[PDB]
């Protein structure tokens, strides 16, 4: 179903998402990845973090920029459904 996300970057050194809110979200919730240069995978969104690194609640605000874990490497303009 509908995009979540649009993935800006990806950080090897600790395998951080940077992505852009394009739908609510929230911890919790069951994403897919998916783009040309990666095999798809499910995730399970966990702790959320701000631009500055604080920890959010959920992705509530459009276009907002929002960082967490992943379980495998994302390149820029990956994209997530929920």
Same mark, same amino acid.
């Given at each position: 179903?509908? !995009?979540? /996300? =649009? *993935? =800006? %970057?990806?950080?090897?050194?600790? %395998?951080?998402?940077? #992505? ?7 911890? /919790?919730?069951?994403?897919?990845? !998916? /783009?040309?240069?990666?095999?798809? !995978?499910?995730? *399970? ?7 500055? %690194?604080?920890? =959010? ?8 920029? #929002? &960082?967490?874990? *992943?379980?495998?490497? =994302? ?6 459904? &929920?």
């Amino acid at each position: 179903r509908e !995009f979540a /996300g =649009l *993935v =800006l %970057g990806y950080d090897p050194e600790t %395998g951080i998402a940077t #992505v852009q809110q394009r739908n609510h979200f929230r911890p /919790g919730d069951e994403v897919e990845f !998916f /783009g040309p240069e990666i095999e798809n !995978f499910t995730q *399970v969104i966990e702790k959320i973090w701000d631009e500055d %690194g604080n920890e =959010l609640d959920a992705a509530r605000h459009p276009l907002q920029i #929002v &960082k967490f874990k *992943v379980k495998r490497p =994302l390149f820029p303009y990956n994209m997530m459904r &929920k």
